[PDB]
């Protein structure tokens, strides 16, 4: 009910040389706002902290990384002259007082910097219905959803059964697999499973949907390729239960 730390935007794809501005709103009543960069290669690294509209502490980033804080404690950070290695999760944390009170993190802004927007592809999404042998041997039925060929890794996969989001019986891979592990802007694949009882699967009225939200190009990004512009979109696949 009470809002936690909020961050906007959620996802960004930029080309080299561009700039971005990110915003964070602290928990109500928190006044210390901190920014961190998380990369696979360098881990979580401190950018800077703000309190009462001024920078209180700073990390070791070059001057093209900048910040500010408004009178209502909202904070922005900016990155100019973007480079590939700036691809990261940009996390903000709020605290009542960072010296003696816990840090509370947002969920981050995921930034991917690419050489070329022609590298960006939405997922193809498919559902694969259960094995007959699984149903006879176990009295259970596993559906698989595959999301493939996407770049960047800005996807959210969810399952819906009769219109209600489910978590019971689900497992989605924690990370995607690189389809060509040696290339820096390789496309990705992701799998997920939804397991239900045989009885549930055997009812043709039951409806199963695998949803993938993909966060892609802005309406302000130019696009001159023949293929469809890889905008933010949902790609989905579905199945209905089946008797014997």
């Amino acid at each position: 009910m009470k809002a936690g730390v909020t961050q906007t935007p959620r996802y960004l794809i930029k080309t080299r040389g561009q700039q971005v501005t990110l915003s964070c709103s602290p928990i109500s009543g928190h006044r210390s706002v901190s920014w961190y960069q998380q990369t696979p290669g360098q881990g979580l690294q401190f950018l800077f902290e703000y309190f009462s509209e001024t920078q209180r502490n700073k990390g070791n980033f070059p001057g093209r990384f900048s910040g500010r804080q408004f009178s209502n404690s909202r904070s922005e950070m900016n990155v100019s002259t973007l480079e590939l290695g700036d691809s990261a999760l940009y996390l903000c944390a709020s605290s009542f007082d960072s010296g003696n009170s816990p840090l509370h993190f947002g969920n981050g802004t995921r930034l991917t910097v690419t050489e070329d927007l022609n590298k960006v592809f939405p997922p193809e999404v498919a559902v694969f219905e259960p094995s007959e042998a699984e149903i006879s041997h176990t009295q259970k039925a596993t559906l698989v959803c595959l999301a493939t060929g996407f770049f960047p890794d800005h996807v959210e996969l969810s399952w819906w059964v009769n219109g209600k989001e489910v978590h019971s019986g689900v497992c989605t891979d924690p990370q995607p697999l690189k389809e060509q592990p040696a290339l820096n802007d390789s496309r990705y694949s992701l799998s997920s499973r939804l397991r239900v009882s045989a009885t549930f699967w055997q009812n043709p009225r039951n409806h199963f949907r695998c949803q993938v939200q993909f966060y892609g190009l802005s309406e302000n990004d130019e696009w001159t390729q023949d293929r469809a512009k890889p905008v933010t979109q949902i790609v989905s696949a579905e199945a209905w239960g089946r008797a014997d």
């Binding site: 996390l91 009170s101 840090l103 993190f105 498919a126 259960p130 094995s131 699984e134 595959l146 019986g169």
Partner: protein, 202 residues
């Protein structure tokens, strides 16, 4: 002096129910607080414990952390581990004018599979896809899933699902390909799988 935060082990796999120990060390003892966090994939961090520089320990639930400031050490003890403890655990210290995070411990707490029933199943093709898909499922948690010998066969790692209203958990791995010389019989040939694994006739 230069602060360095070290966490070990980098990765820990353990059976549910076991106690766990997470280590954090810092070379500059002049800190104001030490904090432990968890991070789930796809998410930000969640504060678990904050130990002030004047305190020797903090407890919440099954978590207890000690701080030995002069020795430059903290230990996080997790009692009676649960699958929902699986996460990356981060140690941070607050210095006079800087903040420093360790590289983390990636914790995986594996479920005990009461009645393993290892099998490799073929899923139905989709009319809207060109992939062939195979499911290795219901194996016990000591089984390791390897990558294929083939660069165009894709295999995920074991993922645990929980059918809550049936009190049932199971492991699975997915394999797929769109090459034609590919079959579920051979999909997991690069893995050491149970000798009693069920291969239904196609």
């Amino acid at each position: 002096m230069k602060q360095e935060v070290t966490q070990i082990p980098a990765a820990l796999s353990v059976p549910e129910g076991e106690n766990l120990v997470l280590n954090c060390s810092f070379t500059d003892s002049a800190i104001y607080n030490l904090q432990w966090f968890r991070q789930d994939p796809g998410k930000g961090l969640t504060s678990l414990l904050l130990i002030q520089s004047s305190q020797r320990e903090q407890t919440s639930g099954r978590l207890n952390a000690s701080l030995d400031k002069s020795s430059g050490r903290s230990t996080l003890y997790i009692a009676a581990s649960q699958p929902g403890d699986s996460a990356t655990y981060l140690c941070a210290v607050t210095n006079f004018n800087k903040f420093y995070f360790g590289s983390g411990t990636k914790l995986n707490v594996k479920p005990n599979i009461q009645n393993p029933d290892p099998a490799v199943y073929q899923l139905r093709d989709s009319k809207s896809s060109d992939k062939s898909v195979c499911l290795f499922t219901d194996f016990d948690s000591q089984t390791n899933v390897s990558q294929s010998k083939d660069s165009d066969v894709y295999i995920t790692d074991k993922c645990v699902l929980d059918m809550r209203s049936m009190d049932f958990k199971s492991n699975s791995a997915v394999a797929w390909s769109n090459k034609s010389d590919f079959a579920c019989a051979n999909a997991f040939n690069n893995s050491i799988i149970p000798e009693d694994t069920f291969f239904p006739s196609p």
